[PDB]
């Protein structure tokens, strides 16, 4: 079980590091397993959204996804 968990975490970290290398998601200092995506909620607002990786099946998910956000998360999956 520990070996499987280590492999899971390593694969997730490798994918996250590739995404950071592509410089699409900024780095989250508070959480090493949370990716920050910059999106403007309004004309002047420019806010980050937290995307997380499922440790079991590995599909990206949002913290409080809107219907469009959920649809595009499914598209990402």
């Amino acid at each position: 079980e520990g070996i499987l968990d280590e492999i899971m975490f390593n694969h997730a970290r490798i994918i996250r590091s590739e995404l950071l290398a592509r410089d699409i998601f900024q780095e989250d200092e508070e959480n090493s397993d949370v990716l920050l995506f910059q999106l403007p909620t309004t004309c002047v607002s420019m806010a980050p959204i937290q995307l997380k990786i499922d440790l079991l099946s590995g599909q990206f998910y949002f913290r409080n996804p809107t219907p469009l956000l959920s649809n595009y998360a499914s598209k990402i999956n």
Binding site: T41, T42, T66
Partner: protein
């Protein structure tokens, strides 16, 4: 869906009983606050004219 919040706003200006000035839906509280501020500003302008 027992978890998401949907806010339906119906603002009827003082013109007719059935002439609904605006009828919108919102899923983001930030947009709710923005539209509330806009409605308050519009009402203030109407009171100023």
């Amino acid at each position: 869906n027992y978890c998401n919040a949907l806010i339906h706003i119906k603002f009827s200006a003082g013109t007719e009983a059935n002439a609904v000035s605006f009828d919108t839906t919102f899923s983001d509280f930030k947009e709710v606050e923005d539209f509330l501020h806009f409605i308050v500003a519009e009402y203030i302008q109407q009171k100023k004219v």
